Amino acid sequence: AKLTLDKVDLKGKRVIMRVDFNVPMKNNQITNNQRIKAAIPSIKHCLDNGAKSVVLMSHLGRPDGIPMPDKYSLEPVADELKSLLNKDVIFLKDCVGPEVEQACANPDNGSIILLENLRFHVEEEGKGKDSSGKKISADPAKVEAFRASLSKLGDVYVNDAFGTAHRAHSSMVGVNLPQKASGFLMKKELDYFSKALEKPERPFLAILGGAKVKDKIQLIKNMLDKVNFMIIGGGMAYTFLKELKNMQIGASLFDEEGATIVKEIMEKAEKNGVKIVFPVDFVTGDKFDENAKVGQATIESGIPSGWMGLDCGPESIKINAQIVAQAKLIVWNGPIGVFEWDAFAKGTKALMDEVVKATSNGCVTIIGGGDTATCCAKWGTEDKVSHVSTGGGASLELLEGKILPGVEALSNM
């Protein structure tokens, strides 16, 4: 329901665009330009649609409100963008100030400008850390002076940075322009999560994985008000199993605090006519380590002392397959085993295999931006599923029922 890039007339207008350029980079090298490739459609569309200019702002790393051009500069990204675009980019040493305003006042037609790391200013995030790592706070008055500067730099504002739309930062909620719209990536993020929330197709399956239960209560609860089925994997499972199946979980992880909301969750599951499924057998390790001895266990046998459950097993994979294959909409957030290690990634991979199969068969599949979005990368299925969120933190909040400021800041119609 929010304004989008292709619905705005960018004829002869300057465009201030907030994009995701937080790329892994060691020594100003950039070890994965993926996120930079991703923003090109939006920028291209602006040039191709008559934009006088396009001003790009972003952040990279953890400078926490201190300019740090030596390790978190966007400069290496600015000329990496030139390569990818086969067009020169003008890098500005800062993101605000007199120089930055003149440079973007009335640029030559079609020029592309990239401002320095926004987080070099404590006003962007609204918080920070000084020379000794201690937390400092931005002055609400300087924050608004910073935002007044950023707004001048453009005539139309475009947010194509979903990954930080769950945080009301300056670049996200502070640009005051008549039209604030979603970029092509952002638009896609919204288009799909809108599906899994406004009026989902059924059967709607929610696969929730992860380590602790305490920080998934909201996500679990909000999903129970919408889905038909729900699978819970990952370390969480052991908390529910010990509490619902009197299972000896050995030395597996256990969320003591979350264990007290279990019965509250199962209630929710019942009032909403949903039946959660958990593993039934497990792949174990004699220690939380990649090359640990691998063993097997079931709910009945439980994990031996010392050992711990690290991935679901053969019967769990089968049950999972059956349920995945009967869904029209699947939302997957969180692997169901320690995917970082192959000895215990089988369950997660099998699930991926099945989910990809569901996409081919008409099922819309949505993946969380965190640990799950990287799984598609490690196994090239980023183009075999309906959607892979480009932002873990934001997708989690969206799926939790929380308000995403960056989004509500966008214009309507």
Residues near ligand ATP (CB under 6 A) are 209-212, 234-235, 253, 309-311, 333-335, 337-338, 340, 368, 370-372, 392, 396
> What is the distance between the alpha carbons of residues 376 and 382, in angstroms, rounded to a whole number?
5
| Residue whose CB is less far from ligand ATP, 15 or 249 | 249
Q: Is 74 annotated as a binding residue?
A: no
The Cα 88–Cα 187 span in angstroms is 27
35 classed as catalytic:
yes
Q: From CA 345, how far away is CA 340, in angstroms rounded?
A: 7
Identity of the residue, 154 or 391, whose beta carbon is nearer to ligand ATP in the bound complex: 391
Which stretch of DSSP H or E encloses residue 158? strand 156-160
169 is in an annotated binding site: no
How far apart CA 377 and CA 381 sit, in angstroms, is 7
For ligand ATP, the nearest residue by Cβ is 210
Q: Which is nearer to ligand ATP, 222 or 333 (CB)?
A: 333
- In whole angstroms, the minimum distance from the beta carbon of 128 to ligand ATP comes to 25
Indicate which residue of 313, 368, 370, 391 is catalytic: 370
Q: Is 212 a catalytic residue?
A: yes
Least distance CB 132 / ligand ATP (angstroms): 29
Q: Which two tokens stand for residue 97?
A: 């100030």
* Residue 393 annotated among the catalytic residues of the structure: yes
Taking the C-alpha atoms of residue 283 and residue 290, their distance in angstroms, rounded to an integer, is 13
Question: Which of 212, 378, 384, 402 is flagged as catalytic?
Answer: 212
Among residues 179, 182, 217, the alpha carbon closest in space to that of 402 is found at 217
Q: Which helix (H) or strand (E) holds 124?
A: helix 122-125
257 is in an annotated binding site: no
Catalytic residue from among 13, 14, 18, 35: 35
Q: How far is CA 27 from the centre of its chain?
A: 25
395 is in an annotated binding site: no
Residue 126, marked binder = no
Q: Is 113 marked within a binding site?
A: no
Q: Catalytic residue at 370?
A: yes
Cβ(210)–Cβ(222) below 8 Å: no
Q: In terms of CB distance, is 107 or 235 closer to ligand ATP?
A: 235
Instruction: Give the whole-angstrom CA distance, residue 179 versus residue 237.
Output: 46
Nearer to ligand ATP (CB atom), residue 159 or residue 316: 316
The H-or-E segment that residue 150 falls in is helix 140-152
Supply the minimum distance, in Å, between the C-beta of residue 74 and ligand ATP.
Answer: 25
Nearer to ligand ATP, 323 or 376 (CB): 376
Kindly state the smallest distance separating residue 35's Cβ from ligand ATP, in Å: 17
Q: Which of 110, 295, 393, 401 is catalytic?
A: 393
Which sign does the torsion angle of CA 331, 337, 342, 347 carry? negative
Other CB atoms closer than 10 Å to residue 306's CB: what's the count? 11
Q: Which residue has the tokens 């990287």?
A: 374
Residue positions counted in the chain = 413
Annotated ligand binding at 79? The verdict is no
The alpha carbon of 236 is separated from its chain's Cα centroid by a whole number of angstroms, namely 20
Known binding residues are 19-22, 34-35, 58-59, 61-62, 118-119, 166-167, 210-212, 215-216, 234-235, 309, 334, 336, 339-340, 371-372
Active site residues: 35, 212, 370, 393
Residues annotated within a binding site for CDP? 210, 215, 234, 334, 336, 339
Residues contributing to the annotated binding site for (2R)-3-phosphoglycerate? 19-22, 34-35, 58-59, 61-62, 118-119, 166-167
